């Protein structure tokens, strides 16, 4: 199906305790594979996926250079941003930057995106055709004119449409075993009495990848989204994901309810009842 190569950049100033902390992470789909943290002495881009542990010095030299360069620009942008607002030199401020490229299920290039955020709010944004920027925050108009006068979008369109895509393909090859493996969820229902007359039916979905999933309870066979406590999809920490759904039920009527699971690694949807 569709695949993507996304990066997430974050720089946070600490006015009192020195230079801004910069962190960078790379993702193929729901898998992180690289990261750069400038919070150490002699910082480098390091692998965070096993299928990356055998790359050449040449690779990490270049990624370390790019990350380093970005960290310095973000550090100075922060100071610049401080003036765009009448902000004091005492507060810590946050600059974020995410960019990625997506392949269609047909495996070709489909789309690209790029965005900046200041203190958690849409700041500057690259247009869909990737040929110019837009001030989303009214206070970003200067950053906008400077970016469009210097054709910064052109360097980004180049990266997103060509460079980024090529490496996404390489990454999918190097990591095929896990990246292209549809790991299906392991499901089951648990029972938890609340009183003599009520009980919680909790449907689990464990150890599945990718992260997209759907858990629904059906009363008798009808919709029943009210009553269903749904937790956010959570990382198991070994590369897979978890998620559960719970519904409150009268003691003795468990069989009326059924759990429905939809995943990409499941040939057909799955149904669970609680088995006494």
């Amino acid at each position: 199906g569709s695949h993507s190569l996304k990066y997430f950049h974050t720089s946070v100033s600490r006015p009192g305790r020195g230079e801004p902390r910069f962190i960078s992470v790379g993702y193929v789909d729901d898998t992180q594979f690289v990261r750069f943290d400038n919070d150490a002495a002699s910082p480098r881009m390091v692998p965070r996926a096993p299928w990356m542990e055998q790359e050449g010095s040449e690779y990490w030299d270049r990624e370390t250079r790019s990350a380093r360069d970005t960290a310095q620009i973000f550090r100075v942008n922060l100071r610049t941003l401080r003036g765009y607002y009448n902000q004091s030199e005492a507060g810590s401020h946050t600059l974020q930057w995410m960019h990625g490229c997506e392949l269609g299920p047909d495996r070709r290039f489909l789309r690209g995106y790029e965005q900046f955020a200041y203190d958690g709010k849409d700041y500057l944004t690259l247009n869909e055709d990737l040929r110019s920027w837009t001030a989303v925050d009214t206070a970003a108009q200067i950053s906008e004119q400077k970016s469009n006068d210097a054709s910064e979008a052109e360097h980004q369109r180049a990266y997103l449409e060509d460079t980024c895509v090529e490496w996404l393909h390489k990454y999918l090859e190097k990591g095929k075993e896990t990246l292209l493996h549809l790991e299906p969820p392991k499901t089951h229902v648990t029972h938890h009495p609340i009183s003599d007359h009520e009980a919680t039916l909790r449907c689990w979905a464990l150890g599945f990848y990718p992260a997209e999933i759907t858990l629904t309870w059906q009363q008798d066979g009808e919709g029943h989204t009210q009553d269903t406590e749904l937790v956010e999809t959570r990382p198991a920490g070994d590369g897979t994901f978890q998620k559960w759904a719970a519904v409150v039920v009268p003691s003795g009527e468990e069989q009326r309810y059924t759990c429905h699971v939809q995943h990409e690694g499941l040939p057909e949807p799955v149904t669970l009842r609680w088995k006494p």
């Binding site: 990066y7 950049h9 960078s24 790379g26 270049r62 990624e63 790019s66 990350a67 360069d69 970005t70 620009i73 973000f74 100075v76 942008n77 610049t80 941003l81 930057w97 960019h99 900046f116 500057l124 970003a140 950053s143 400077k146 970016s147 910064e152 360097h155 980004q156 990266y159 460079t163 980024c164 490496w167």
Partner: peptide
């Protein structure tokens, strides 16, 4: 890989 140059704001 990530981009060679980012934006000067």
């Amino acid at each position: 890989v990530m981009g060679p140059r980012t934006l000067i704001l």
